[PDB]
Amino acid sequence: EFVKEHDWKKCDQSGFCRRNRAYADHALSAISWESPYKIAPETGSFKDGQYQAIILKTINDHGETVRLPLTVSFLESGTARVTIDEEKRQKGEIELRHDSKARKERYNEAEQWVIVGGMTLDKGAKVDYEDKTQMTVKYGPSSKFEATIKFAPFSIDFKRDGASHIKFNDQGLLNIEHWRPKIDPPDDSTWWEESFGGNTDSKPRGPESVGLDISFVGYEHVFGIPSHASPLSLKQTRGGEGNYNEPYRMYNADVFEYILDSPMTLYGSIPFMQAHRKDSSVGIFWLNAAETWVDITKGKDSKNPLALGVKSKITTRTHWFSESGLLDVFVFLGPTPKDIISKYAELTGTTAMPQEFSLGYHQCRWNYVSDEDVKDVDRKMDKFNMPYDVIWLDIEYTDEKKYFTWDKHSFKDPIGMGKQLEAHGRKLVTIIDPHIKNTNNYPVVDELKSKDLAVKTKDGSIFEGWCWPGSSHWIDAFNPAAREWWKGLFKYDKFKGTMENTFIWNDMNEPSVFNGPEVTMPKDNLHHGNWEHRDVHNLNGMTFQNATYHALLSRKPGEHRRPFVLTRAFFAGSQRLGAMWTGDNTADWGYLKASIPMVLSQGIAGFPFAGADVGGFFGNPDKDLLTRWYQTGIFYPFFRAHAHIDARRREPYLTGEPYNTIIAAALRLRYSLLPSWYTAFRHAHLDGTPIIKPMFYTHPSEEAGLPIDDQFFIGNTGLLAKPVTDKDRTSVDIWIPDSEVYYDYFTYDIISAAKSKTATLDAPLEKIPLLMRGGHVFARRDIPRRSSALMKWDPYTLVVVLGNDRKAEGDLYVDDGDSFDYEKGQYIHRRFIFDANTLTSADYEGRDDASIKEGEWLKKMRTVNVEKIIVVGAPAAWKGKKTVTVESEGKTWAAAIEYNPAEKSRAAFAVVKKVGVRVGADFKIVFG
Ligand SMILES: OC[C@H]1NC[C@H](O)[C@@H](O)[C@@H]1O
């Protein structure tokens, strides 16, 4: 690898970060500090759910002002939006330095990239009160939400249920760096050119950062702003025991050997933060694509947060600042975590419906070295009864790092390789990165250049820099023409050697530039639209994944199907485009433990299709670590093993016994649960529901769960997992969230009942700690197969998990896994309800059976049954009854049931075999 010893800006080395931190330091120590920003009330108007006014910023002691247009929107969802722009820049009345052609306006296209819905203004929103000092707007459901806008100094307080929850500018940290010329006196050391990492940023606009304090009143825990190697409940950043000293950073970057427990940026950024306490949740989304830092402190509400004489109630103070663009913030008032995330997903998108196969196990390393290597691994997995769906090719498959080629010495017959995988319904994934080799006899680069599709430098020249191919240029995927060109390259008849089972991995899309500052592009590079790279950096990865997503919709005439694209770099909205992973982690126990809070943070930030490299990327995991890593990785929504080029081969059949058997058992569990995993992805698609769910989300009334980040619920199943992530551990302490009954998934032992507590569970190497909560039904497929495709027509088992209510609910969603026919109703979605000794299956959306004409997939599913029902926590009244009564599609019959009484701590349970009811039809089964 090119960079041996990396240089990352600390906050003091980022000019605008230094300035905003210093602004805070001044404001928070000034006596009677007043923010020098005022609404000019006579400029204000409220109409049809929107307030518009001019904020005047006082810029010097002579009282000179600049005009900053304010827009506050009250949306039908109950979300509010606050936007501040700069009028002189809107009017183009500034002069860029260096004869730069960069845009004069503040970047205002983040919305175009990110926002897909939820923007309808609430015409029911109304001014409840105003005078010459303030105005209050009521909005939200039944007018329950209020925003009080104070004019002088400017502030906004967002209220519900008789209190303030979120305050803007309470601490007076609002900072919009207005345009100024470079003039000498008649601290500006960071205003103009800045050098770092072997590069000087020409900085043609000068200072232009935007920042604000956002206070979460009475909240002690905040969450989100992935991606960081950090706890789910974010740390403070201004010092203290256990805390950081630097703000959280979002500046998508290629961070070689990234460390644990750090606010340093990683590869992707979602500037979305929630605050949660018992029975109250709120949140903000900072819609800004530039380099962004977030400071976090917690204490009392007093100016000295450690003062005596004041109420103890904690407020979390957050200080957001971005290098350029608009101040543009959405405010969510909940009141539950589910509400907040659903509203966020309405704005930025829900999870795309995945390729079904992509929930399977993915086998990868850097590299499989030939087509024969690939075919041998495929055979070996089958010899060792280790199911898997996809094999991956990293960068060594290419001809000298030219994308859209194959190394013909080593990959002689890629179609034959593709066809072998197809015999088990398996897939191939091939890497394609955004750097295009600058060399002769390569039509891809010729077209990139002649069509003007490459990112440019500060002066309009084509950008050149180094990555895997050596000297390279970069696709500018902000350009719609570049995205349309890119589509053409993926057609099966153009990208030779690919076929219908070939999908794509996008990497190095931060962009990673080996000889660039912080391994990325200069900030004064120019993109399509004449935006500076500084304006759009955090969107770059997403634009590239977008290009590839749309290339995979159709690669031959008549084809229309779901993409699968893995990305490294990402932004808000990337959930619409495919999966991510957490990049170059390390083969050590601390990274295994860290993976779970990271993957959880992804899902609560609205991008749940996430995972970490199983085994760790860098290094050689011990056999026990690798084994535990499989047991955790089967709970990542995106489940792939991967290894760095210097790591030994560690395909799972190489581990040896007893590890092989334990790893195979983990794989078999993932596969058996695939019906429930796919259903969980369906809910993520319907309304942004996370796929794996932290305690704050499932149990908003249970304060003790707030920071817990090492256990989680799966989908809609009530399954509670706590993988072992510590070396040589042979037990685990699980926090039981509530008073329901919890059962061991494998033995049906009663682990807890009647009261929230910590329960200690045996957990040797061969144990996956997995509990079933009472009140839930979930589906699985018990028959083991070699791949998910080979399970498509197999019968289902339903597990009905009862607590003392003897009542439960769950669901199952199935479709063809590939097309967009789901949009026209071609799917099965069952709601299963157990109540009063009866299990029923109904269509989840209450559709009439002959409101939909059955396509080919639905017709084939007529042969697919629910065949087995297990009831855990079976009532004693059922003892000695040998049948249940089954009714379906007009027919009634008896099915045999076996009742097993409680024994020691093992629950009573009953099993119905050979139920024989088609999964697509209503049924009613009466027990007892
Ligand atoms: O392609 C080489 C290398 N690039 C960086 C990626 O994070 C890693 O997964 C990959 O193996």
Tab-separated table of C-alpha atoms in Angstrom, residues 12-350:
chain	number	residue	atom	x	y	z
A	12	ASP	CA	-6.657	22.369	15.126
A	13	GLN	CA	-5.240	21.636	11.650
A	14	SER	CA	-8.589	22.187	9.927
A	15	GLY	CA	-8.896	25.928	9.594
A	16	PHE	CA	-12.649	26.221	9.801
A	17	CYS	CA	-12.764	23.710	12.680
A	18	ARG	CA	-10.207	25.806	14.570
A	19	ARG	CA	-12.285	28.941	13.907
A	20	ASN	CA	-15.547	27.390	15.080
A	21	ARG	CA	-14.022	25.855	18.174
A	22	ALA	CA	-12.457	29.222	18.969
A	23	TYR	CA	-15.837	30.926	18.411
A	24	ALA	CA	-17.363	28.526	20.963
A	25	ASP	CA	-14.500	29.102	23.370
A	26	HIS	CA	-15.061	32.883	23.179
A	27	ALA	CA	-18.855	32.704	23.389
A	28	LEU	CA	-18.920	30.249	26.302
A	29	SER	CA	-16.442	32.314	28.316
A	30	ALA	CA	-17.779	35.801	27.323
A	31	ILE	CA	-19.848	37.675	29.852
A	32	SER	CA	-23.420	38.195	28.688
A	33	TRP	CA	-22.512	36.806	25.281
A	34	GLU	CA	-25.119	37.705	22.670
A	35	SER	CA	-25.217	36.052	19.263
A	36	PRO	CA	-24.796	38.912	16.729
A	37	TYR	CA	-27.745	37.716	14.629
A	38	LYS	CA	-31.266	39.149	14.671
A	39	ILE	CA	-34.354	38.587	12.646
A	40	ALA	CA	-35.591	41.863	11.139
A	41	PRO	CA	-39.227	41.266	12.133
A	42	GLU	CA	-40.714	43.491	9.368
A	43	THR	CA	-39.140	41.168	6.802
A	44	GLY	CA	-41.028	38.156	8.204
A	45	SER	CA	-43.994	36.482	6.562
A	46	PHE	CA	-45.848	33.285	7.404
A	47	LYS	CA	-47.901	31.574	4.703
A	48	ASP	CA	-49.041	28.001	4.041
A	49	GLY	CA	-46.646	26.289	6.453
A	50	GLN	CA	-43.564	28.433	5.828
A	51	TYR	CA	-41.925	31.351	7.617
A	52	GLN	CA	-39.501	33.506	5.644
A	53	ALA	CA	-37.458	36.414	7.013
A	54	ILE	CA	-34.078	38.162	6.861
A	55	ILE	CA	-31.538	37.583	9.587
A	56	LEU	CA	-29.091	40.459	9.941
A	57	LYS	CA	-25.640	39.504	11.073
A	58	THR	CA	-23.690	42.322	12.702
A	59	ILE	CA	-20.155	41.915	11.311
A	60	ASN	CA	-18.161	44.687	13.068
A	61	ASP	CA	-18.202	47.432	15.733
A	62	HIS	CA	-19.614	50.020	13.345
A	63	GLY	CA	-22.844	47.966	13.340
A	64	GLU	CA	-22.465	46.983	9.665
A	65	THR	CA	-24.754	44.053	8.751
A	66	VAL	CA	-25.110	41.344	6.140
A	67	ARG	CA	-28.391	39.737	5.110
A	68	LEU	CA	-28.944	35.996	5.668
A	69	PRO	CA	-32.291	34.740	4.380
A	70	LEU	CA	-34.086	32.398	6.809
A	71	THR	CA	-36.685	29.829	5.839
A	72	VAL	CA	-38.558	27.746	8.451
A	73	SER	CA	-40.850	25.079	7.010
A	74	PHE	CA	-43.418	23.099	8.938
A	75	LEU	CA	-44.032	19.848	7.101
A	76	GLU	CA	-47.173	17.656	7.110
A	77	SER	CA	-45.162	14.861	8.740
A	78	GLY	CA	-44.581	17.040	11.803
A	79	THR	CA	-40.936	17.558	10.884
A	80	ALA	CA	-39.624	21.125	10.744
A	81	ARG	CA	-36.835	22.462	8.484
A	82	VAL	CA	-34.613	25.467	9.205
A	83	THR	CA	-32.476	26.894	6.361
A	84	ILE	CA	-30.118	29.894	6.402
A	85	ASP	CA	-28.471	31.169	3.199
A	86	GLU	CA	-26.429	34.281	2.390
A	87	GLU	CA	-28.032	36.907	0.160
A	88	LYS	CA	-24.873	38.420	-1.295
A	89	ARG	CA	-23.860	34.982	-2.486
A	90	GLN	CA	-27.354	34.182	-3.858
A	91	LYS	CA	-27.050	37.399	-5.891
A	92	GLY	CA	-23.543	36.502	-7.134
A	93	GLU	CA	-22.064	39.716	-5.646
A	94	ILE	CA	-18.743	38.237	-4.580
A	95	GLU	CA	-15.467	37.674	-6.361
A	96	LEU	CA	-13.653	34.370	-6.304
A	97	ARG	CA	-9.889	34.467	-5.973
A	98	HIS	CA	-7.385	33.181	-8.579
A	99	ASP	CA	-9.813	33.740	-11.512
A	100	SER	CA	-11.654	30.662	-10.228
A	101	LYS	CA	-14.784	29.545	-12.085
A	102	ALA	CA	-16.132	27.868	-8.920
A	103	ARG	CA	-19.758	28.624	-8.089
A	104	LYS	CA	-20.453	31.732	-6.098
A	105	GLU	CA	-23.669	30.413	-4.487
A	106	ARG	CA	-23.702	28.380	-1.301
A	107	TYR	CA	-24.044	24.744	-2.292
A	108	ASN	CA	-27.739	23.990	-2.458
A	109	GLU	CA	-28.010	20.619	-4.208
A	110	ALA	CA	-27.638	18.303	-1.212
A	111	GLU	CA	-31.458	18.224	-1.227
A	112	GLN	CA	-31.527	17.034	-4.841
A	113	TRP	CA	-29.218	14.111	-3.996
A	114	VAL	CA	-30.667	13.175	-0.620
A	115	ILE	CA	-34.355	14.101	-0.310
A	116	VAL	CA	-36.924	11.860	-2.014
A	117	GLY	CA	-40.119	12.641	-0.093
A	118	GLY	CA	-41.737	14.137	2.963
A	119	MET	CA	-41.551	17.728	1.784
A	120	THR	CA	-45.291	18.614	1.739
A	121	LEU	CA	-45.889	21.830	3.699
A	122	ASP	CA	-48.464	21.772	6.487
A	123	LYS	CA	-51.150	24.349	5.680
A	124	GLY	CA	-52.611	23.574	9.114
A	125	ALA	CA	-49.526	25.044	10.755
A	126	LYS	CA	-50.405	28.392	12.321
A	127	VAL	CA	-49.026	31.398	14.194
A	128	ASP	CA	-50.423	31.039	17.678
A	129	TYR	CA	-48.713	34.086	19.162
A	130	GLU	CA	-46.497	36.892	18.142
A	131	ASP	CA	-45.305	40.222	19.328
A	132	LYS	CA	-42.350	42.410	18.292
A	133	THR	CA	-39.868	40.101	20.115
A	134	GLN	CA	-40.976	36.584	19.031
A	135	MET	CA	-43.478	34.324	17.363
A	136	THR	CA	-44.754	30.849	18.140
A	137	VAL	CA	-45.952	28.468	15.467
A	138	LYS	CA	-48.082	25.459	16.345
A	139	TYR	CA	-47.752	22.486	14.001
A	140	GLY	CA	-47.521	18.716	13.984
A	141	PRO	CA	-50.259	16.181	14.808
A	142	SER	CA	-53.264	17.974	16.273
A	143	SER	CA	-51.094	21.093	16.588
A	144	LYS	CA	-49.147	19.436	19.458
A	145	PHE	CA	-45.719	20.748	18.388
A	146	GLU	CA	-44.517	24.355	18.823
A	147	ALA	CA	-41.601	26.335	17.518
A	148	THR	CA	-40.893	29.620	19.299
A	149	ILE	CA	-38.746	31.869	17.116
A	150	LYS	CA	-37.093	34.715	19.060
A	151	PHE	CA	-35.949	37.626	16.944
A	152	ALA	CA	-33.186	39.322	18.967
A	153	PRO	CA	-30.908	37.487	19.464
A	154	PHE	CA	-32.135	34.875	16.980
A	155	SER	CA	-33.048	31.531	18.572
A	156	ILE	CA	-35.552	28.739	18.064
A	157	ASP	CA	-37.077	26.504	20.761
A	158	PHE	CA	-38.899	23.360	19.658
A	159	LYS	CA	-41.489	22.182	22.171
A	160	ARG	CA	-44.036	19.516	22.918
A	161	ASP	CA	-45.761	17.973	25.957
A	162	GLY	CA	-45.231	21.142	28.001
A	163	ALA	CA	-41.443	21.466	27.587
A	164	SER	CA	-38.638	22.549	25.309
A	165	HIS	CA	-36.826	19.573	23.752
A	166	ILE	CA	-34.485	21.087	21.177
A	167	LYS	CA	-32.997	24.589	21.224
A	168	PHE	CA	-31.117	26.284	18.395
A	169	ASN	CA	-28.613	29.035	19.373
A	170	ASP	CA	-29.322	28.918	23.111
A	171	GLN	CA	-25.551	29.160	23.630
A	172	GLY	CA	-25.169	31.716	20.813
A	173	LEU	CA	-22.860	29.614	18.621
A	174	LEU	CA	-24.634	30.362	15.342
A	175	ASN	CA	-21.860	31.190	12.842
A	176	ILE	CA	-22.317	31.892	9.149
A	177	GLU	CA	-18.970	33.036	7.720
A	178	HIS	CA	-20.036	35.750	5.319
A	179	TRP	CA	-17.963	36.402	2.194
A	180	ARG	CA	-15.089	38.863	2.579
A	181	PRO	CA	-12.268	40.005	0.317
A	182	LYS	CA	-8.652	39.316	1.218
A	183	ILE	CA	-7.474	42.651	2.567
A	184	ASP	CA	-4.635	43.602	4.868
A	185	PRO	CA	-5.269	45.647	8.030
A	186	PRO	CA	-5.821	49.339	7.123
A	187	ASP	CA	-6.789	36.048	13.275
A	188	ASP	CA	-6.957	35.503	9.496
A	189	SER	CA	-4.159	32.914	9.325
A	190	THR	CA	-6.570	30.099	8.301
A	191	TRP	CA	-8.801	32.179	6.034
A	192	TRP	CA	-6.989	31.768	2.713
A	193	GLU	CA	-4.500	29.142	1.394
A	194	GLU	CA	-3.991	26.186	3.734
A	195	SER	CA	-1.413	23.435	3.325
A	196	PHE	CA	-1.692	19.891	4.593
A	197	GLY	CA	-0.612	16.448	3.451
A	198	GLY	CA	1.528	17.687	0.552
A	199	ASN	CA	-1.221	19.881	-0.911
A	200	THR	CA	-2.147	23.546	-0.774
A	201	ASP	CA	-5.827	24.373	-0.939
A	202	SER	CA	-6.120	27.565	-3.005
A	203	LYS	CA	-9.342	28.334	-1.143
A	204	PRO	CA	-10.820	30.688	-3.800
A	205	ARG	CA	-13.906	31.623	-1.691
A	206	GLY	CA	-12.169	32.203	1.606
A	207	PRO	CA	-14.058	31.478	4.841
A	208	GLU	CA	-17.589	30.176	4.407
A	209	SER	CA	-18.343	27.734	7.200
A	210	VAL	CA	-21.779	27.322	8.813
A	211	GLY	CA	-22.280	26.244	12.432
A	212	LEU	CA	-24.846	26.115	15.188
A	213	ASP	CA	-25.371	24.891	18.749
A	214	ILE	CA	-28.223	22.423	19.070
A	215	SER	CA	-29.255	21.618	22.643
A	216	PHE	CA	-31.152	18.456	23.623
A	217	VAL	CA	-32.935	19.624	26.739
A	218	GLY	CA	-33.142	17.023	29.478
A	219	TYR	CA	-31.391	14.307	27.395
A	220	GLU	CA	-28.246	12.566	28.600
A	221	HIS	CA	-27.770	10.250	25.600
A	222	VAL	CA	-27.318	11.053	21.915
A	223	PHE	CA	-26.846	8.639	19.047
A	224	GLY	CA	-26.033	8.490	15.320
A	225	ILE	CA	-23.625	10.390	13.048
A	226	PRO	CA	-21.994	7.179	11.758
A	227	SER	CA	-19.498	6.020	10.801
A	228	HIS	CA	-17.145	5.943	13.803
A	229	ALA	CA	-15.370	3.342	15.895
A	230	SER	CA	-17.286	4.587	18.897
A	231	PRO	CA	-20.090	3.491	21.216
A	232	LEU	CA	-23.672	3.748	20.056
A	233	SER	CA	-24.305	6.333	22.806
A	234	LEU	CA	-21.882	8.977	21.602
A	235	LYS	CA	-19.149	10.380	23.816
A	236	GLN	CA	-18.414	13.924	24.850
A	237	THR	CA	-15.638	15.591	22.855
A	238	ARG	CA	-14.324	18.420	25.078
A	239	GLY	CA	-12.465	16.272	27.583
A	240	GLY	CA	-13.131	14.363	30.764
A	241	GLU	CA	-12.479	10.822	31.890
A	242	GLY	CA	-13.524	8.361	29.224
A	243	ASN	CA	-14.354	11.142	26.756
A	244	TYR	CA	-12.703	12.462	23.591
A	245	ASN	CA	-10.817	15.729	23.143
A	246	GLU	CA	-11.698	16.324	19.486
A	247	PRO	CA	-15.134	16.600	17.856
A	248	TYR	CA	-16.665	13.750	15.930
A	249	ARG	CA	-15.536	14.188	12.283
A	250	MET	CA	-17.399	13.370	9.048
A	251	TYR	CA	-15.066	13.591	6.066
A	252	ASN	CA	-15.210	10.370	4.130
A	253	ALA	CA	-11.642	9.062	4.033
A	254	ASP	CA	-9.524	5.989	3.408
A	255	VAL	CA	-8.264	5.410	6.950
A	256	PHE	CA	-5.599	2.664	6.949
A	257	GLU	CA	-5.515	0.644	10.183
A	258	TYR	CA	-8.236	2.734	11.785
A	259	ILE	CA	-8.182	2.626	15.586
A	260	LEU	CA	-10.883	1.732	18.083
A	261	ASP	CA	-12.723	4.259	20.278
A	262	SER	CA	-12.054	7.406	18.305
A	263	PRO	CA	-13.931	10.396	16.917
A	264	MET	CA	-11.768	10.286	13.763
A	265	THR	CA	-13.654	10.091	10.489
A	266	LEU	CA	-14.061	6.805	8.659
A	267	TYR	CA	-15.338	6.088	5.123
A	268	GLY	CA	-18.999	7.234	5.214
A	269	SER	CA	-21.006	9.934	6.983
A	270	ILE	CA	-24.682	10.315	7.886
A	271	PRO	CA	-25.212	13.647	9.741
A	272	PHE	CA	-28.296	12.470	11.656
A	273	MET	CA	-28.423	12.565	15.481
A	274	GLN	CA	-31.095	11.362	17.912
A	275	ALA	CA	-31.557	12.009	21.615
A	276	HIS	CA	-33.409	9.431	23.733
A	277	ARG	CA	-34.585	9.290	27.337
A	278	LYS	CA	-37.321	7.287	29.013
A	279	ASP	CA	-40.464	7.704	26.882
A	280	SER	CA	-39.170	10.702	24.933
A	281	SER	CA	-37.196	10.916	21.685
A	282	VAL	CA	-36.139	13.730	19.338
A	283	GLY	CA	-33.589	14.228	16.582
A	284	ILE	CA	-32.016	16.445	13.939
A	285	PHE	CA	-30.697	15.876	10.425
A	286	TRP	CA	-27.950	18.315	9.319
A	287	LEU	CA	-28.303	18.301	5.552
A	288	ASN	CA	-24.786	19.361	4.549
A	289	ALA	CA	-22.334	17.473	2.268
A	290	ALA	CA	-19.124	19.298	3.238
A	291	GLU	CA	-16.607	18.386	5.914
A	292	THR	CA	-18.567	18.425	9.200
A	293	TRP	CA	-17.525	18.267	12.837
A	294	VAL	CA	-19.716	17.772	15.895
A	295	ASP	CA	-18.729	18.670	19.459
A	296	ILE	CA	-20.744	17.120	22.329
A	297	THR	CA	-20.859	18.137	26.000
A	298	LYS	CA	-23.212	17.190	28.816
A	299	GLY	CA	-24.022	18.908	32.046
A	300	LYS	CA	-26.464	21.079	33.907
A	301	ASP	CA	-28.280	23.836	32.027
A	302	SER	CA	-26.298	26.623	33.713
A	303	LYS	CA	-23.532	28.511	31.965
A	304	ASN	CA	-21.153	26.695	34.272
A	305	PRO	CA	-22.481	23.166	33.758
A	306	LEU	CA	-20.940	22.055	37.077
A	307	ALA	CA	-22.480	24.861	39.139
A	308	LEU	CA	-24.178	24.430	42.507
A	309	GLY	CA	-27.481	26.101	43.251
A	310	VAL	CA	-29.208	24.835	40.124
A	311	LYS	CA	-31.439	21.982	38.980
A	312	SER	CA	-29.563	18.729	38.303
A	313	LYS	CA	-31.307	17.955	34.994
A	314	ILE	CA	-28.777	17.254	32.216
A	315	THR	CA	-28.823	18.908	28.814
A	316	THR	CA	-26.647	17.639	25.998
A	317	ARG	CA	-25.005	20.490	24.091
A	318	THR	CA	-23.974	19.792	20.509
A	319	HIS	CA	-22.043	22.140	18.248
A	320	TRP	CA	-22.226	21.354	14.522
A	321	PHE	CA	-20.095	23.023	11.842
A	322	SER	CA	-19.561	22.386	8.148
A	323	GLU	CA	-17.031	23.862	5.799
A	324	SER	CA	-19.424	25.281	3.212
A	325	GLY	CA	-22.986	25.142	1.865
A	326	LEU	CA	-26.286	26.022	3.533
A	327	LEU	CA	-27.189	25.802	7.159
A	328	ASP	CA	-29.991	23.313	6.587
A	329	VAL	CA	-31.489	21.293	9.443
A	330	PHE	CA	-34.501	19.040	9.893
A	331	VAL	CA	-36.024	18.716	13.361
A	332	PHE	CA	-37.841	15.552	14.467
A	333	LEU	CA	-40.011	15.500	17.605
A	334	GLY	CA	-40.830	11.787	17.844
A	335	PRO	CA	-41.964	10.980	20.482
A	336	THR	CA	-40.541	7.455	19.930
A	337	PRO	CA	-37.389	6.212	18.255
A	338	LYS	CA	-39.496	4.405	15.670
A	339	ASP	CA	-41.286	7.671	14.834
A	340	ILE	CA	-38.043	9.563	14.321
A	341	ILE	CA	-36.396	6.983	12.095
A	342	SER	CA	-39.602	6.504	10.042
A	343	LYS	CA	-39.850	10.254	9.423
A	344	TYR	CA	-36.140	10.398	8.535
A	345	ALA	CA	-36.640	7.535	6.038
A	346	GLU	CA	-39.644	9.295	4.475
A	347	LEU	CA	-37.264	12.229	3.748
A	348	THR	CA	-34.076	10.410	2.691
A	349	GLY	CA	-35.441	7.065	1.559
A	350	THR	CA	-36.136	3.621	2.920
